[PDB]
Amino acid sequence: MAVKVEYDLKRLRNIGIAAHIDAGKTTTTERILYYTGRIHKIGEVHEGAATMDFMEQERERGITITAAVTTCFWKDHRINIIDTPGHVDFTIEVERSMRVLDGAIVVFDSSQGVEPQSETVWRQAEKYKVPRIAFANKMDKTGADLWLVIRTMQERLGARPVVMQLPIGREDTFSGIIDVLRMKAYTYGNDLGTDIREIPIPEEYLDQAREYHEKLVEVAADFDENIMLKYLEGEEPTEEELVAAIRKGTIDLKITPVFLGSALKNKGVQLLLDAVVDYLPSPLDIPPIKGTTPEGEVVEIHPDPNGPLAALAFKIMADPYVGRLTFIRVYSGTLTSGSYVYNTTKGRKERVARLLRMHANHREEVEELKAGDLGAVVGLKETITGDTLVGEDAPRVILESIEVPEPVIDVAIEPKTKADQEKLSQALARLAEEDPTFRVSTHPETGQTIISGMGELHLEIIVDRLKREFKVDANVGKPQVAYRETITKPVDVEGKFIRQTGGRGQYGHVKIKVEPLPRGSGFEFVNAIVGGVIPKEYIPAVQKGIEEAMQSGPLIGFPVVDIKVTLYDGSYAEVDSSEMAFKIAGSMAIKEAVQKGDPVILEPIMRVEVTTPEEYMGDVIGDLNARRGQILGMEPRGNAQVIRAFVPLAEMFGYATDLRSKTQGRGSFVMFFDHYQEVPKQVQEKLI
């Protein structure tokens, strides 16, 4: 539609943002919305629920978060800010977004470049197959070298930037834009110097431009055989042919545009918005597509709001103004205001008062929400994230199959006055819905939490969250190891218990041989007996006394596993003997035999296979030996070299920053616990 009900979505521009600053997204976004919408409110600097600790990091390294939805109009071209604000750690919503969006957009202040985190956002952009651009804004601000960013693209992805412009001046001197294919420039006036005068290209950029009209016809021939065939023929194709090809090519992600300039003093900006429309599409410029039913039919999701509804619920806040804003994305179908609207994976209609699209710090109210669209509901004052919704009219599609952040920094946690535990299970209950950047698990002995999460940065963001919202006090324990205890040498003992209680004497005597035994036996009892002496009558108790002194091991008192017990001798006489006496007598016997049979505690032993360069072996080898590594071989993976090793759990627990530092030369790694092995003995003895 070219009528509103659909048209805001039918001209929409799904952009997914990574940015640095100075220009960047957050430094730029409000007054550049002033330069075409003549208003605007962003709200990311700096927003809770967490961030006032790691706000400075957020800005450089992804960009600032909380601005995610925006609609604005250039000449009925609805020009849009859409999800993925900046986060590189929190990438459930990035995975959701790359399947949704069309433009993955890197913003610079022109002296910035491609970071680790930029590389990560390209891999995520890659995974769900988006077109992308870069724009070097603030070319009139120092350090501004376009060609390293071109160079780095050529280098880093091995691949094709495409030069969209030449500038006139650079870092310290920018003042005009050269179109390199139409071979002409435009210069930009004042403080508000969107004042354009179409000047020539000066000689100094003519040749790179000419190469580039040539490269831009070249590039155009790459998406339309008529332009190649005319190029081939001896025509050079014409602008319009090229304009039509570039759209084809861009939506097929066959290019990566690199732009420059400086929108800072308004310069040219309104006219640029027309190139957005030209080469990128709407989310309604795709058809009905498939998700699979609960009975296993592939099933039509409709990019066509007229069709079957399909929705994901992704973001819950509580509010004073509605009480509760519940943010939802519709994938297909039309959800209308003033109604009760359907959740399939709950099974119910809940009551919509108003339908809104929620921006950073503010609402805009709407009649309806459609196939590809997002917004916030008024009404529904308990409805939750993480259900899958399809309509009353729909087949029951799959919309969601996204992969989650995953850990590399482990923390055991303990609240301390128990009042901080009280407002901790509240704080944990909140963080548990909200945070896919950790993994939680319960030591249930204590009832304590052992978190693993998603990086130093993730743990910073937690910390950040803690200082703001939680108001909780806690002692964070170590990343820590599990045990077993065991005998190593066999030793041969006796147990006696002869004392009076209950009128008469109580008398237990047993003679055991206690041995090391292989695993998954647990206990093993051999009765050399042949009844009497250490008699059969008293055995289940006499075995019971061993069974309970297995549970306390003889080092720090952790369970002692797999030992072979041969019961051979003893004595008894009932008027003075008892089976419990015999139990206690058996109980006594063992502790000494296992102790003199040289016991040890066992710590969980990991097997690790690590992809590295092979002379990066001499980078890694001192860390690996400190980390107690024992090489099992060196095997290439992909292309690059996987060193195998066996490692006891306890030394790895610092790593995560150094970890992104260790993930070199087509880097990767796997890890599993395999078996227990013994804890360094001198240290071991200290724990007791």
XYZ file of N, CA and C in Angstrom, residues 190-364:
525
model
N 27.866 26.550 4.242
C 28.089 26.876 5.561
C 28.085 25.795 6.684
N 27.685 26.304 7.845
C 27.362 25.655 9.101
C 26.164 24.760 9.074
N 25.366 25.079 8.080
C 24.188 24.412 7.782
C 24.220 24.178 6.284
N 25.470 23.899 5.802
C 25.903 24.032 4.386
C 25.609 22.860 3.564
N 24.329 22.398 3.680
C 23.650 21.551 2.713
C 23.430 22.312 1.440
N 23.610 23.666 1.405
C 23.892 24.443 0.217
C 24.850 23.820 -0.781
N 24.281 23.358 -1.866
C 24.918 22.541 -2.819
C 25.114 23.483 -4.063
N 26.343 23.426 -4.636
C 26.590 23.981 -5.929
C 27.361 22.901 -6.641
N 26.848 22.418 -7.785
C 27.452 21.462 -8.623
C 28.658 22.051 -9.398
N 29.822 21.755 -8.796
C 31.071 22.173 -9.252
C 31.648 20.997 -10.089
N 32.569 21.250 -10.983
C 33.388 20.149 -11.490
C 34.177 19.323 -10.509
N 34.600 18.112 -10.934
C 35.733 17.417 -10.283
C 37.025 18.158 -10.519
N 37.813 18.584 -9.549
C 39.135 19.061 -9.856
C 39.967 17.994 -10.404
N 40.915 18.231 -11.271
C 41.910 17.299 -11.814
C 42.422 16.214 -10.809
N 42.659 16.574 -9.527
C 43.314 15.795 -8.517
C 42.536 14.559 -8.107
N 41.275 14.505 -8.470
C 40.465 13.328 -8.191
C 39.826 12.786 -9.500
N 40.032 13.442 -10.618
C 39.560 13.001 -11.904
C 39.843 11.561 -12.390
N 41.110 11.146 -12.226
C 41.590 9.837 -12.589
C 41.084 8.706 -11.785
N 40.962 8.795 -10.419
C 40.337 7.830 -9.582
C 38.839 7.790 -9.887
N 38.224 8.975 -10.114
C 36.884 8.987 -10.593
C 36.649 8.288 -11.894
N 37.479 8.596 -12.922
C 37.400 7.984 -14.250
C 37.584 6.468 -14.244
N 38.458 6.021 -13.357
C 38.714 4.646 -13.114
C 37.382 4.113 -12.568
N 36.811 4.895 -11.666
C 35.576 4.531 -11.020
C 34.348 4.701 -11.864
N 34.242 5.550 -12.924
C 33.081 5.496 -13.781
C 33.213 4.251 -14.506
N 34.468 3.951 -14.808
C 34.835 2.730 -15.460
C 34.527 1.584 -14.567
N 34.922 1.573 -13.269
C 34.647 0.582 -12.245
C 33.139 0.529 -11.976
N 32.400 1.626 -12.014
C 30.982 1.628 -11.816
C 30.226 1.091 -13.035
N 30.585 1.371 -14.298
C 30.077 0.547 -15.386
C 30.475 -0.949 -15.294
N 31.766 -1.254 -14.898
C 32.242 -2.567 -14.621
C 31.408 -3.352 -13.629
N 31.252 -2.744 -12.441
C 30.362 -3.140 -11.402
C 28.912 -3.335 -11.916
N 28.373 -2.444 -12.746
C 27.008 -2.586 -13.271
C 26.773 -3.706 -14.206
N 27.791 -3.958 -15.013
C 27.876 -5.103 -15.953
C 27.867 -6.401 -15.154
N 28.221 -6.313 -13.865
C 28.318 -7.509 -13.011
C 26.906 -7.916 -12.580
N 25.753 -7.141 -12.896
C 24.464 -7.590 -12.368
C 23.457 -7.623 -13.435
N 23.808 -7.202 -14.658
C 22.873 -7.171 -15.737
C 23.630 -7.477 -16.966
N 23.305 -8.545 -17.620
C 23.919 -9.024 -18.820
C 23.754 -8.011 -19.979
N 22.639 -7.183 -20.077
C 22.620 -6.177 -21.074
C 23.740 -5.129 -20.923
N 24.115 -4.758 -19.673
C 25.150 -3.844 -19.500
C 26.405 -4.508 -19.761
N 26.722 -5.746 -19.324
C 27.874 -6.456 -19.730
C 27.973 -6.676 -21.297
N 26.841 -7.155 -21.876
C 26.717 -7.382 -23.270
C 26.893 -6.077 -24.039
N 26.283 -4.910 -23.703
C 26.690 -3.689 -24.308
C 28.174 -3.301 -24.057
N 28.661 -3.396 -22.815
C 30.097 -3.169 -22.537
C 31.044 -3.980 -23.438
N 30.705 -5.264 -23.619
C 31.234 -6.268 -24.477
C 31.159 -5.917 -25.959
N 29.985 -5.403 -26.346
C 29.602 -5.013 -27.656
C 30.524 -3.843 -28.066
N 30.715 -2.832 -27.151
C 31.558 -1.670 -27.379
C 30.797 -0.390 -27.041
N 29.556 -0.527 -26.590
C 28.855 0.503 -25.916
C 29.438 0.642 -24.528
N 29.450 1.804 -23.914
C 29.510 1.800 -22.471
C 28.118 2.059 -22.053
N 27.355 1.248 -21.368
C 26.063 1.535 -20.771
C 25.977 2.774 -20.048
N 24.738 3.224 -20.012
C 24.186 4.518 -19.526
C 23.652 4.483 -18.117
N 23.552 5.623 -17.431
C 23.294 5.727 -16.025
C 22.183 4.914 -15.470
N 21.064 4.973 -16.139
C 19.841 4.311 -15.832
C 19.964 2.828 -15.846
N 20.760 2.287 -16.729
C 21.015 0.894 -16.848
C 21.742 0.376 -15.645
N 22.799 1.114 -15.300
C 23.635 1.021 -14.090
C 22.731 1.167 -12.802
N 21.820 2.246 -12.734
C 21.000 2.491 -11.491
C 20.161 1.253 -11.094
N 19.641 0.590 -12.161
C 18.756 -0.567 -12.105
C 19.574 -1.794 -11.737
N 20.862 -1.899 -12.230
C 21.746 -2.999 -11.968
C 22.246 -3.054 -10.483
N 22.606 -1.872 -9.970
C 23.116 -1.606 -8.654
C 22.103 -2.011 -7.622
N 20.817 -1.736 -7.821
C 19.816 -2.253 -6.949
C 19.823 -3.751 -6.926
N 19.788 -4.345 -8.126
C 19.855 -5.797 -8.203
C 21.015 -6.488 -7.411
N 22.238 -5.952 -7.632
C 23.521 -6.214 -7.091
C 23.612 -5.967 -5.593
N 23.170 -4.837 -5.118
C 23.121 -4.485 -3.734
C 22.168 -5.409 -2.982
N 20.973 -5.764 -3.528
C 20.025 -6.552 -2.749
C 20.490 -8.022 -2.797
N 21.370 -8.346 -3.784
C 22.045 -9.634 -3.880
C 23.390 -9.657 -3.141
N 23.686 -8.540 -2.433
C 24.845 -8.321 -1.611
C 26.182 -8.600 -2.196
N 26.234 -8.200 -3.508
C 27.326 -8.488 -4.350
C 28.415 -7.427 -4.251
N 28.101 -6.390 -3.519
C 28.976 -5.237 -3.351
C 29.073 -4.820 -1.955
N 30.121 -4.056 -1.563
C 30.093 -3.415 -0.291
C 30.494 -1.946 -0.574
N 29.486 -1.089 -0.580
C 29.673 0.301 -0.749
C 30.526 0.896 0.316
N 31.440 1.819 0.024
C 32.106 2.645 1.066
C 31.931 4.083 0.707
N 31.333 4.786 1.658
C 30.940 6.183 1.454
C 31.826 7.009 2.328
N 31.882 8.284 1.942
C 32.528 9.282 2.690
C 31.748 10.555 2.669
N 32.127 11.446 3.625
C 31.741 12.867 3.480
C 31.717 13.605 4.797
N 30.734 14.524 5.020
C 30.630 14.941 6.410
C 29.314 15.635 6.488
N 28.304 14.936 7.038
C 26.939 15.376 7.336
C 26.850 16.326 8.448
N 28.019 16.558 9.176
C 28.110 17.425 10.336
C 27.445 18.773 10.223
N 27.767 19.535 9.174
C 27.153 20.844 9.030
C 26.045 20.768 8.023
N 25.234 19.652 8.027
C 23.974 19.443 7.192
C 24.355 18.971 5.815
N 25.590 18.638 5.505
C 25.964 18.835 4.184
C 25.499 17.789 3.106
N 24.377 18.040 2.395
C 23.807 17.251 1.308
C 22.808 16.239 1.672
N 22.491 16.207 2.962
C 21.977 15.041 3.601
C 20.600 14.649 3.043
N 19.630 15.615 2.786
C 18.288 15.264 2.403
C 18.269 14.487 1.117
N 19.126 14.826 0.144
C 19.184 14.212 -1.192
C 19.710 12.773 -1.120
N 20.462 12.389 -0.057
C 21.172 11.132 0.093
C 20.128 10.001 0.296
N 19.045 10.360 1.043
C 17.906 9.621 1.506
C 17.200 9.040 0.299
N 17.277 9.659 -0.876
C 16.753 9.104 -2.112
C 17.538 7.926 -2.651
N 18.902 7.869 -2.451
C 19.739 6.736 -2.762
C 19.408 5.545 -1.835
N 19.022 5.705 -0.522
C 18.439 4.660 0.299
C 17.297 3.791 -0.279
N 16.362 4.515 -0.848
C 15.198 3.973 -1.536
C 15.547 3.173 -2.810
N 16.550 3.669 -3.550
C 16.927 3.270 -4.832
C 17.515 1.915 -4.837
N 18.366 1.622 -3.858
C 19.228 0.482 -4.011
C 18.925 -0.599 -3.006
N 18.299 -0.170 -1.865
C 17.807 -1.113 -0.876
C 16.304 -1.258 -0.947
N 15.659 -2.328 -0.467
C 14.248 -2.554 -0.580
C 13.421 -2.338 0.679
N 12.112 -2.578 0.682
C 11.285 -2.655 1.863
C 11.200 -4.003 2.520
N 10.839 -4.232 3.840
C 10.533 -5.638 4.268
C 9.233 -6.208 3.631
N 8.465 -5.397 2.884
C 7.316 -5.940 2.188
C 7.640 -6.160 0.715
N 8.928 -6.269 0.335
C 9.329 -6.398 -1.038
C 9.874 -7.843 -1.259
N 9.504 -8.730 -0.356
C 9.615 -10.117 -0.302
C 8.220 -10.862 -0.191
N 8.024 -12.082 -0.692
C 6.715 -12.717 -0.604
C 6.424 -13.535 0.636
N 5.231 -13.943 0.979
C 5.037 -15.171 1.701
C 6.053 -16.307 1.645
N 6.583 -16.809 2.790
C 7.758 -17.628 2.940
C 7.467 -18.589 4.055
N 8.403 -19.459 4.479
C 7.935 -20.720 5.022
C 8.412 -20.796 6.503
N 7.585 -21.364 7.431
C 8.013 -21.805 8.706
C 7.280 -23.133 8.833
N 7.593 -24.005 9.696
C 7.010 -25.364 9.715
C 5.977 -25.549 10.831
N 4.819 -26.261 10.650
C 3.743 -26.432 11.630
C 4.142 -27.331 12.798
N 3.507 -27.375 13.945
C 3.701 -28.395 14.996
C 3.476 -29.816 14.585
N 2.696 -30.067 13.501
C 2.592 -31.388 12.946
C 3.461 -31.578 11.743
N 4.260 -30.574 11.360
C 5.473 -30.778 10.575
C 5.447 -30.457 9.113
N 4.368 -29.790 8.733
C 4.105 -29.198 7.486
C 4.986 -27.910 7.261
N 5.783 -27.788 6.241
C 6.236 -26.406 5.944
C 5.057 -25.490 5.501
N 5.081 -24.217 5.950
C 3.785 -23.559 6.223
C 4.013 -22.125 5.942
N 3.059 -21.429 5.401
C 3.376 -20.084 4.939
C 3.235 -18.947 5.929
N 4.353 -18.326 6.366
C 4.526 -16.993 6.956
C 4.271 -15.961 5.896
N 3.554 -14.883 6.166
C 3.229 -14.041 5.036
C 3.899 -12.689 5.018
N 4.928 -12.327 4.287
C 5.260 -10.961 3.971
C 4.281 -10.334 3.014
N 3.204 -9.903 3.672
C 1.888 -9.663 3.163
C 1.056 -9.678 4.475
N 0.735 -8.463 5.034
C 0.116 -8.326 6.301
C -1.333 -8.689 6.168
N -1.816 -8.757 4.950
C -3.134 -9.128 4.530
C -3.316 -10.611 4.797
N -2.258 -11.353 4.594
C -2.136 -12.729 4.904
C -2.041 -13.134 6.384
N -2.124 -14.417 6.737
C -1.655 -14.998 8.041
C -0.685 -14.271 8.834
N -1.088 -14.066 10.131
C -0.166 -13.552 11.149
C 0.889 -14.491 11.698
N 2.046 -13.917 12.046
C 3.200 -14.666 12.519
C 3.958 -13.630 13.363
N 4.246 -13.767 14.665
C 4.912 -12.768 15.402
C 5.897 -13.390 16.432
N 6.952 -12.659 16.825
C 7.823 -13.014 17.918
C 7.693 -11.871 18.924
N 7.633 -12.208 20.217
C 7.632 -11.283 21.332
C 9.094 -11.264 21.850
N 9.781 -10.080 21.773
C 11.202 -10.022 22.125
C 11.618 -9.103 23.233
N 10.844 -8.112 23.768
C 11.377 -7.182 24.761
C 10.276 -6.708 25.722
N 10.395 -7.048 27.028
C 9.552 -6.551 28.106
C 10.055 -5.402 28.970
N 9.507 -4.173 29.054
C 9.839 -3.322 30.158
C 8.699 -3.015 31.121
N 8.951 -2.714 32.463
C 7.851 -2.046 33.202
C 7.985 -0.571 33.111
N 6.856 0.191 33.181
C 6.820 1.558 32.776
C 5.983 2.263 33.882
N 6.192 3.507 34.272
C 5.111 4.347 34.716
C 4.702 5.161 33.492
N 3.511 4.945 32.928
C 2.920 5.725 31.861
C 1.885 4.744 31.255
N 2.174 3.406 31.164
C 1.226 2.329 30.875
C 1.246 1.336 32.015
N 2.286 1.414 32.954
C 2.587 0.280 33.784
C 3.621 -0.672 33.203
N 3.417 -0.986 31.943
C 4.087 -2.107 31.293
C 4.017 -1.902 29.833
N 5.200 -1.684 29.188
C 5.328 -1.848 27.794
C 5.890 -3.212 27.401
N 5.126 -3.912 26.584
C 5.458 -5.113 25.985
C 5.754 -4.883 24.506
N 7.074 -4.911 24.114
C 7.511 -4.747 22.663
C 7.356 -6.106 21.884
N 6.717 -6.015 20.641
C 6.609 -7.154 19.776
C 7.004 -6.849 18.325
N 7.572 -7.907 17.643
C 7.743 -7.871 16.219
C 6.706 -8.885 15.550
N 5.915 -8.357 14.613
C 5.133 -9.037 13.697
C 5.988 -9.381 12.485
N 5.895 -10.673 12.080
C 6.619 -11.158 10.907
C 5.688 -11.198 9.707
N 4.460 -11.549 9.980
C 3.446 -11.597 8.963
C 2.128 -11.204 9.601
N 1.143 -10.935 8.750
C -0.165 -10.575 9.247
C -0.258 -9.131 9.698
N -1.529 -8.800 10.082
C -1.873 -7.408 10.578
C -2.468 -7.544 11.955
N -1.929 -6.846 12.981
C -2.364 -6.759 14.298
C -2.898 -5.330 14.466
N -4.196 -5.143 14.746
C -4.890 -3.841 14.743
C -5.134 -3.401 16.233
N -5.054 -2.067 16.425
C -5.358 -1.418 17.673
C -6.767 -1.616 18.128
N -7.022 -1.455 19.418
C -8.371 -1.349 19.957
C -8.962 -2.698 20.004
N -8.268 -3.714 20.528
C -8.715 -5.089 20.359
C -8.187 -6.063 21.364
N -8.420 -7.349 21.100
C -7.766 -8.379 21.852
C -7.095 -9.199 20.821
N -5.787 -9.435 21.008
C -4.959 -9.937 20.010
C -4.308 -11.257 20.352
N -3.906 -12.140 19.429
C -3.657 -13.578 19.770
C -2.178 -13.894 19.850
N -1.819 -14.618 20.958
C -0.630 -15.429 21.189
C -0.765 -16.896 20.925
N -0.238 -17.489 19.886
C -0.316 -18.949 19.781
C 0.331 -19.793 20.825
N 1.589 -19.553 21.240
C 2.198 -20.450 22.231
C 1.820 -20.265 23.696
N 0.999 -19.252 24.017
C 0.071 -19.236 25.175
C -1.283 -19.745 24.873
N -1.942 -19.307 23.787
C -3.198 -19.799 23.322
C -4.324 -18.828 23.588
N -4.031 -17.536 23.621
C -5.136 -16.638 24.186
C -5.093 -15.337 23.469
N -6.251 -14.631 23.380
C -6.240 -13.189 23.207
C -6.123 -12.417 24.516
N -5.129 -11.502 24.659
C -4.999 -10.379 25.484
C -5.255 -8.990 24.855
N -5.609 -7.978 25.738
C -6.350 -6.789 25.342
C -5.438 -5.629 25.069
N -5.398 -5.266 23.781
C -4.762 -4.085 23.215
C -5.728 -2.930 23.364
N -5.350 -1.960 24.202
C -5.823 -0.584 24.165
C -5.222 0.117 22.923
N -3.909 0.519 22.928
C -3.261 1.317 21.874
C -2.040 0.483 21.309
N -1.728 0.734 20.029
C -0.574 0.213 19.378
C 0.337 1.333 19.018
N 1.599 1.141 19.326
C 2.627 2.171 19.333
C 3.906 1.623 18.626
N 4.712 2.539 18.173
C 6.082 2.098 18.029
C 6.886 2.907 19.052
N 7.670 2.118 19.836
C 8.457 2.608 20.899
C 9.853 2.886 20.468
N 10.233 4.159 20.617
C 11.611 4.656 20.344
C 12.254 4.731 21.669
N 13.503 5.341 21.729
C 14.465 5.256 22.766
C 13.965 5.750 24.110
N 13.200 6.788 23.998
C 12.776 7.515 25.184
C 11.358 7.950 24.946
N 10.714 7.326 23.991
C 9.381 7.790 23.668
C 8.667 7.007 22.622
N 7.364 7.206 22.739
C 6.284 6.482 22.083
C 5.953 7.262 20.734
N 5.414 6.546 19.741
C 4.508 7.023 18.738
C 3.355 6.062 18.543
